[PDB]
Design a binder for this molecule. Structure first.
Ligand SMILES: [Mn+2]
Ligand SMILES: [Mn+2]
Ligand SMILES: [Mn+2]
Ligand SMILES: [Mn+2]
Lengths: 196, 196, 196, 196
């Protein structure tokens, strides 16, 4: 039922910021596995739910969150990147950012600190808080998705699982984050922002 | 779809060990709420699953675990108690206990320590480990059910949420546990044991 | 080293909103135990730290958080209540509240929903976010303290562990929260607010 | 106060099972950082403890567990590996394994499944349960150390953080685990076993 989305660009389109090998493995191996495991899990769940098996439903939660979240997180991630990205955003998004973070650079600073501070595997996110009407930074462990676990609407996500950058930046997570700013697709972040 | 099971005895049948007021509130108020909230949650979940909404499925996990677990835990609990309970078990169960804990009294000791040691709300459990083929003691937080979260088959559960004993024993959890041994339905624990 | 603070009022001073029995048990039994267990734990920790025993330091974390948090949370709680409290706050605090929540009543609404929504044992909090410079509502499980786990400065806390209200309101948590508004010490919340 | 232990062998001594690049990065970069961050954290903690600052003590727990656990876990890991390892264990350890797992191969199977099943970052462990007197398999998230969080005495640990194997086995965690069996230092696991 769920499927692996095609990448809107070639695997080597983000060089030299993120090399082709990482993109190929990240998409065709990591994301593909999450989609496949998600469909298997949803199927078992449909089954447990049909016969009112509460125990089975609860036992399947970790697998559904990990794989379901994995699919959601990476799907957004691909659209957040672009060989034509980089620079700074414009319009209302830029204003919202100055408003809520003081300046674009302070925002970069914050999101970078949150991403680098993730203990173990996880994601750094720029999300929108519907209740307050402000932008908000949050970090999620493993594949826990932003909206499903915090209620925030995801605008921009940064994957900090080691498979995201190890082949190229090894243990230096800060180098990875410094480079990713050059390929952020602000046009996509902007429309996600305008949508909510 | 799920329903509140009738108690196999009168509300005051466990006096003076657990008074009638607690039993009445615990069953007709606490357990009833879990069953009702469970049906509402499973329904929303059926809905999220039908349209492949992964985000909604993940957001509903806490409510399904709390209410689904609440229903499962209390349902077992009622059958674990009896106005004719108390004393010690006999047969294979008693042997399994001596085998795995040394003696019946050391077992009581262990399970009591685990129950009293729960930080906040939770349950103390005597469960069966299918893999090892031995009895095992475990404690679960809030309403997290034994089997669904640990894989152990539940044999005997002791509810240590404060609503379990506060009206009668106030803050003295140890007095509550000392009294509950007088109403344990060993015949029920035995058949749960024989079943697995 | 740490000690049980005296209550700034008589045990029955909050009647009929919170009866004397609850206040007496809550202070002399529950809080006293947390203080005593905290001193024992800090002592063991001083010891583990002296000989560089990392394993022991990590094993003691749950007990230090539960008891240390228990002491911190209840200490603030006593000052948040007053036989002369109730009504609405005035000055800058009232403005900060209208600003961040729309109105005082919407604020009450929010904090009440957060408190009632705590699964199991926990606290509902009105805190101050130093980074953003705005008021913020948060809920913490068990005795996890607000500042130590979220960074927010605590202004007003509402204890929703069942021992907080069970003797008087039984399972009806909403009745408990409706009554507590009549004894909130706004003068204390205000000065905590002015301090940060 | 704490220090980076020297490796008991050359960085390329485990080839071709684990290449030299991984060993060099894993030891001189990853482990070194944990030791350095641990000393900084213990120092801040000594300070918080001296002035009875409970809030600061609690805020430092995540950093102490991650770095303290990181140091403990990797220190054991280095001794668990050897260019002269591989094969099967002998003596009492082998008997304990047959006893508790049926056979050596079923044990390998179990530990492999536990290691591969870790969601995100973590470790698979073969530990000793002092209470029961049996061997036990457990998995821990991130750098949470075995003994400090479960009470089990660590005998053999397998690091499944992606930095452990990504450069060489990429996303195929099962290939990594199949290869690591060839360098397990059973003589070290045996003496850890005899010690407890
Ligand atoms: Mn990824
Ligand atoms: Mn209950
Ligand atoms: Mn309390
Ligand atoms: Mn490692």
């Amino acid at each position: 039922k769920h499927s692996l989305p095609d990448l809107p660009y070639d695997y080597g389109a983000l060089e030299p910021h993120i090399n082709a090998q990482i993109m190929q493995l990240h998409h065709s191996k990591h994301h593909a596995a999450y989609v496949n495991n998600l469909n298997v899990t949803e199927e078992k769940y449909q089954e447990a739910l049909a016969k009112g098996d509460v125990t089975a439903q609860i036992a399947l939660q970790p697998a559904l969150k990990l794989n379901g979240g994995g699919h959601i997180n990476h799907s957004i991630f691909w659209t957040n990147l672009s060989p034509n990205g980089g620079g700074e955003p414009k319009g209302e998004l830029l204003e919202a950012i100055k408003r809520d973070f003081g300046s674009f650079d302070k925002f970069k600073e914050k999101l970078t600190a949150a991403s680098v501070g993730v203990q173990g595997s996880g994601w750094g996110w720029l999300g929108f808080n519907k209740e307050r009407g402000h932008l908000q930074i949050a970090a999620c462990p493993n594949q826990d998705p932003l909206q499903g676990t915090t209620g925030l609407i995801p605008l921009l996500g940064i994957d900090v699982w080691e498979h995201a950058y190890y082949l190229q930046y090894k243990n230096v997570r800060p180098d990875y984050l410094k480079a990713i700013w050059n390929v952020i697709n602000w046009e996509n972040v902007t429309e996600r922002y305008m949508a909510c």
